[PDB]
């Protein structure tokens, strides 16, 4: 289902400051950024925590409690590995120049 506006804005603000803090950049295609941000928001709405939208889980409540895949996940925090392509290191071929993304960009690129 569609995530709440408020959770999307939570996860948008998070993405901006975390990209800045980690020295990473959003994908050249900000549709990819926007889709992942909405997945984080949807998981926050449904499970109580922004579990990685590019992982499959058995027991959601146990994954929320243990926290390994709660964004920013352990591979991102420790190795700067973001397989969702939300936070891209500057050497990555699909890293763009932006560490910001507006609500309008999120809505435009995910309208379809």
């Amino acid at each position: 289902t569609e995530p709440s506006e408020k959770s999307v804005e939570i996860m948008r603000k998070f993405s901006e400051q975390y990209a800045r803090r980690s020295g990473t950049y959003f994908c050249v295609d900000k549709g990819v950024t926007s889709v992942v941000i909405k997945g984080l928001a949807e998981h926050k709405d449904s499970y109580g925590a922004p579990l990685c939208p590019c992982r499959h889980y058995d027991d959601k409540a146990a994954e929320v409690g243990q926290g390994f895949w709660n964004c920013p996940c352990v591979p991102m925090r420790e190795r700067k590995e973001c397989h969702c392509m939300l936070f891209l290191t500057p050497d990555n071929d699909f890293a763009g120049k932006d560490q910001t993304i507006t609500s309008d960009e999120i809505k435009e690129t995910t309208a379809n």
Partner: protein, 110 residues
């Protein structure tokens, strides 16, 4: 299933299609609604289905409704691709790695 295109399947329609495939190889794209890289590789997956018209290309949304089939097939990374021959999974490819998927299709055909 129309071949030359990608057919959406669910937990009830997937295995009968595999059974009906006969000697055709089946490819399955296991995706979720909000995985960015899934959406990146999806058009390339469609082009593979238009090239490999002697194979059956499927996609499965790994949501709550389809979780029993997701659990049976096995998935941790999104995307995950499965290649099936003769009623079983023979190969998997994890991630949105187009060249890895291509190489696995080519290996399965050899």
């Amino acid at each position: 299933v129309t071949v030359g295109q990608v057919t959406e399947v669910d937990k009830d329609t997937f295995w009968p299609i595999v059974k009906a495939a006969g000697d055709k190889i089946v490819v399955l794209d296991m995706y979720t609604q909000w995985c960015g890289p899934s959406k990146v590789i999806a058009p390339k997956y469609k082009e593979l289905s238009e090239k490999y018209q002697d194979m059956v290309f499927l996609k499965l949304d790994c949501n709550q409704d389809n979780k029993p089939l997701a659990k049976e097939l096995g998935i941790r990374v999104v995307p995950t691709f499965k290649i099936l021959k003769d009623n079983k999974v023979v190969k998997e490819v994890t991630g949105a790695k187009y060249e890895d998927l291509l190489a696995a299709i080519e290996a399965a055909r050899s």
